[PDB]
Write a protein that binds this ligand. Sequence first.
Ligand SMILES: O=C[C@@H](O)[C@@H](O)[C@H](O)[C@H](O)CO
Ligand SMILES: OC[C@H]1O[C@@H](O)[C@@H](O)[C@@H](O)[C@@H]1O
Length: 391
Amino acid sequence: GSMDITRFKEDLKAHLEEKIIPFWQSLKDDEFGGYYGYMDFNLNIDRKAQKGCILNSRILWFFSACYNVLKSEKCKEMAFHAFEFLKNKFWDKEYEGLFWSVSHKGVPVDVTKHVYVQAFGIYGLSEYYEASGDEEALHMAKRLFEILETKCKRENGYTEQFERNWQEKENRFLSENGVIASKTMNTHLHVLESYTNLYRLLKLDDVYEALEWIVRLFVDKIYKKGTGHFKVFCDDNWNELIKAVSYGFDIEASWLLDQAAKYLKDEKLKEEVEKLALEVAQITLKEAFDGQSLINEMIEDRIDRSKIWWVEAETVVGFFNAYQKTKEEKYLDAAIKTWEFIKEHLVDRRKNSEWLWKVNEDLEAVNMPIVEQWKCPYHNGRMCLEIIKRV
Ligand SMILES: O=C[C@@H](O)[C@@H](O)[C@H](O)[C@H](O)CO
Ligand SMILES: OC[C@H]1O[C@@H](O)[C@@H](O)[C@@H](O)[C@@H]1O
């Protein structure tokens, strides 16, 4: 820590409190429950938009973590509102687990069960349990864990997509050329993340074993040894469908794996994981940090130098984490300058807005929604919360 790091945290706390929190408070749907599901680039909310379960759970996580860190009573009420919509509309009373999507009124639109959705449910419900003490939220998280472990897990990871009644299906995520990816970095990273939070709160043996198991899967199958990159979209045997590098996923997995490593009881694996996380952060700085911000991805030989909101948020956390473990100032410098880029190019200058989805290579804003099933307060809100907690 120093004077720059302290002012850094203060700046992120003010941004979260004066920009992020009140923006997402304005998305609260008091007519039907939950949160409005879409806001276009011109800041027009579509109150009738379908509501994604992942978005609701990320909002639940965000407001819960805000209460847990800042003790804001309004944030706890905002989390309650999202918990109520999860409980009443996304949770399947008959077969259990969480639907994929519902209408703005809460009518089930896509009742299939995806591990990606269940994991985010565990993440938000456990966070909300810490904030509220609600035993029903704790029950749902535990049941989601047992379902994942007893119905969805396989020898080499999770089957990712299921019918409503948990009969397995082929996956819904597709490679760039339309081949089904039976194994995705996406799903398994958020299983890891949700299990870390669950174990941190519960400290249960069964949960520890599943956490260690998923950490090992990342070390043994998903990580591309010696490259600093993880596989993104795979067949059922963790063979890449395409040579693809997501620098955003790399740097996020870097600090998430580092985080889980703190709980590991096998000291060899723990040293392994901490070395992996730093190898990834080192490669990421060298290959994807342009001196200003992080580029997006490389698909085969095509580089996308767009600046995506969640990539830069995770870059700030990942590089700050790398700085904390090494004390090498190149990482701290990179994290702060990425924050300075976000402030100048991704924080919307129009009133009553939040963060732009992306700017292109030429730093031009691109027409993309401000709120969508995949654009949430989770990444950028967690960026602020992490720095607040770490400094
Ligand atoms: O398609 C993109 C998303 O499903 C995620 O892959 C992405 O990393 C962020 O989570 C955006 O929400
Ligand atoms: O690769 C296809 C296979 O991938 C698995 O993970 C499951 O989704 C199976 O239902 C499917 O047959």
